[PDB]
């Protein structure tokens, strides 16, 4: 029980920001105990655990905050679609941050768990690197209204940063779509086909990850248990609409890339004709020549192979004439 | 389905109505006010001329060709009491056919 599933073993650090209307303190540490006392504090706190491959810390904080070990295993589980679970003590959501590489077109996903408990938010991540820097400066520099509100608005801000990163990823994918759409039409090779296959798989992954996100954000503003407070409904509504936008773009891109695949797949089944033509013309050309050469190659010791009128030039001339005749046999039916 | 209100789209000011098509060339308002006695055809470009026909007793047909000018659609909706979400649905083009019954 309580086993880590991902593939990250690089770094593990803990970060805490405690902000109020006037008070603010941000720090980083690597001891699980130091973040424990913040639970009973009335101030809105943000706790971040970058490395969850150390299961002991995860279990320790789970026991401290009085949460079910099943959701502990869900946090440790990494291959899972986003979901939302409303419990009386805490509300627990699962999201996925995406990263893209334009040099090598691949999509990397990281599972991130967010738990809201009264005046605290707990974030569990896979590796180091976040999309929450804008909200980090929002708390740090007091710009914006993040400090005035409670931890529900902090959950809203984290989800907003998530969907903003989704928008950036969609911009990168749109540029890739344009490049590939031009290249497939005007540069047909195998690398284009491999890139199109990779792009289709990446868009399928995006669809499978984003469609449950719509349901999560719908739940966070329709069911709205007392944890989120009635003052935060419109913001989650806005994030829900943003998720709708991201979806609709995802299906549009999927349709376009499927059309590209269909075009290339239609271009195939005519290379068979060309290659068959090449094979059959070279066979019809060169099998007769080999046939005659072998026939004159047999040593029966009684063949009229004497010089006479020079046999070798005559044989070569006749063979070349036969080859030219076989060539002329083609192109009559447009071969 | 729950309640309905204007969607919030990233990158736009709140409550902004945008035409989502590709045609931005033509605009006219053609009005046919007909009755049992005689008809009235009136093609124009000014938008204030057609607005008073909301209270006309005889049947009226107000054909606005060209919705790329969102201000005309917004003015017509504001005068006729059309809900802003209905105006957004008018302007939004990527939409399957549908019907909605209001009061």
């Amino acid at each position, epitope marked *: 029980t309580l086993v880590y599933t991902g593939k990250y073993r690089e770094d593990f650090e803990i970060e805490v920001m405690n902000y109020s209307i006037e008070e603010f303190r941000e720090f980083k540490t690597t001891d699980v105990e130091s973040v424990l006392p913040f639970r009973d504090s009335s101030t809105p706190t943000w706790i971040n655990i970058t490395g969850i491959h150390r299961t002991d810390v995860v279990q320790r904080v789970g026991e401290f905050f009085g949460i079910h070990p099943l959701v502990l295993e869900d946090i440790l589980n990494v291959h899972q679609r986003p979901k939302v679970e409303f419990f009386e003590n805490y509300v627990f959501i699962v999201l996925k941050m995406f990263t893209y590489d334009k040099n090598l077109h691949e999509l990397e996903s990281e599972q991130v768990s967010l738990i809201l408990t009264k005046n605290c938010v707990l974030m569990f991540q896979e590796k180091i690197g976040d999309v929450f820097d804008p909200v980090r400066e929002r708390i740090r520099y007091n710009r914006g209204i993040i400090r005035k509100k409670r931890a529900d608005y902090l959950l809203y801000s984290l989800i907003d940063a998530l969907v903003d990163d989704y*928008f950036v990823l*969609l*911009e*990168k994918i*749109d*540029d*890739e779509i*344009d*490049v590939l759409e*031009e290249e497939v039409l005007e540069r047909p090779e195998k690398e284009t086909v491999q890139r199109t296959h990779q792009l289709k798989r990446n868009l399928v992954e995006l669809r499978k990850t984003i469609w449950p996100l719509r349901e999560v954000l719908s739940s966070l503003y329709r069911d709205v248990p007392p944890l989120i407070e009635k003052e935060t409904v419109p913001y989650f509504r806005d994030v829900y609409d943003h998720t709708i*936008q*991201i979806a*609709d*773009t995802v299906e*549009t891109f999927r349709d376009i890339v499927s059309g590209l695949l269909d075009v290339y797949l239609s271009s195939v089944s005519n290379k068979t004709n060309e290659v068959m033509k090449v094979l059959t013309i070279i066979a019809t050309i060169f099998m007769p020549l080999t046939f005659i050469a072998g026939i004159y190659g047999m040593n029966f010791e009684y063949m009229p192979e004497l010089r006479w009128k020079w046999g070798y030039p005559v044989v070569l001339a006749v063979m070349g004439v036969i080859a030219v005749i076989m060539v002329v046999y083609f192109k009559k039916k447009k071969w | 389905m729950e309640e309905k209100r204007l969607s919030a*789209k*990233k*990158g*736009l*000011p*709140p*409550g*902004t109505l*945008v*035409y*989502t*098509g*590709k045609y*931005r*060339e033509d605009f006219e308002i053609e009005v046919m006010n007909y009755s049992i006695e005689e008809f009235r055809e009136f093609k124009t470009t000014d938008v204030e001329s057609v607005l008073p026909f909301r209270d006309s007793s005889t049947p009226t047909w107000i054909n606005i060709t060209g919705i*790329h000018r*969102t*201000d005309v659609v*917004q*003015r017509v909706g504001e005068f006729f009491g059309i809900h802003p979400l209905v105006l957004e649905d008018i302007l939004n083009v*990527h939409q399957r056919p549908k019907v909605e019954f209001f009061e």
Partner: antibody, heavy 123, light 106 residues
Framework: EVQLVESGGGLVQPGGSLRLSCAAS????????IHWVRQAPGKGLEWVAS????????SYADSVKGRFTISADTSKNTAYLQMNSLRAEDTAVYYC???????????????????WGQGTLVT | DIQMTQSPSSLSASVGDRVTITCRAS??????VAWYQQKPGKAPKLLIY???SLYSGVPSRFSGSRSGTDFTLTISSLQPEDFATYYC?????????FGQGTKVEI
């Protein structure tokens, strides 16, 4: 019919202030977005600010943030840009341009300014 | 901030020629690039929006193309009225950014 007129320009002392007024005719500033575009003498165009009067959301370039302030009055169909703490690089010709939005994909929108005024010189 | 560069900084051509001016965007702007024309001493005039669409009433000599993250404005056949400066907008973000402009002269 659609027309934009710029006024309020003129020479001013450094570190001072100057209010530029953009009067719009033939269209309602409430339904559209209004941008201020700055062109230095013998230089390329630069973006100053944008106002969406219906929503009240304003946007500023990072090079004039804070010093410049943009607002709009719907009653007079006017767009005001008041400039404080003017510096040496601000001497330029200011144009006022109305822009609409267009749809590329369900996640991305762009705007293109249709009608521009004659522009006013500020030193 | 999204920085656009544009080349060439000045292009010389005669009437009847084809002229291409290309913008490169540092970041990724989806397709919200706009091409404007400014004659000396007068306000700019919008030519192309959405990287491939023509503003109403603009002559079909101008055309636009987008390869991924760089865009091209191509004039098939010049005319004496097309000898002006050409500018380049990105509008994906709320902060519009211009190019430095290319002066097409004789």
């Amino acid at each position: 019919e659609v027309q934009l007129v710029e006024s309020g320009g003129g020479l001013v002392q450094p570190g001072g202030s100057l209010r530029l007024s953009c009067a719009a005719s033939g269209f309602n500033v409430s339904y559209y977005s209004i941008h201020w575009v700055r062109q230095a003498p013998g230089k390329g165009l630069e973006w100053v600010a944008s106002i969406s009067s219906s929503s009240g959301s304003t946007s500023y370039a990072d090079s004039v943030k804070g010093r410049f302030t943009i607002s709009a009055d719907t009653s007079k169909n006017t767009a005001y840009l008041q400039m404080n703490s003017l510096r040496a690089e601000d001497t330029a010709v200011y144009y006022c341009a109305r822009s609409y939005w267009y749809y590329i994909w369900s996640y991305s929108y762009g705007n293109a300014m249709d009608y521009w005024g004659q522009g006013t010189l500020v030193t | 901030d999204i920085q656009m560069t544009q080349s060439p900084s000045s292009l010389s051509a005669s009437v009847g020629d084809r002229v291409t001016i290309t913008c490169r965007a540092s970041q990724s702007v989806s397709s919200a690039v706009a091409w404007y024309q400014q004659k000396p001493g007068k306000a700019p005039k919008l030519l192309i929006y959405s990287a491939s669409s023509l503003y109403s009433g603009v002559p079909s000599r101008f055309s636009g193309s987008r390869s991924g993250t760089d865009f091209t404005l191509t004039i098939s056949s010049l005319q004496p009225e097309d000898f002006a400066t050409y500018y380049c907008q990105q509008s994906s973000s709320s902060l519009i950014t211009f190019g430095q402009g290319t002066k097409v002269e004789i």
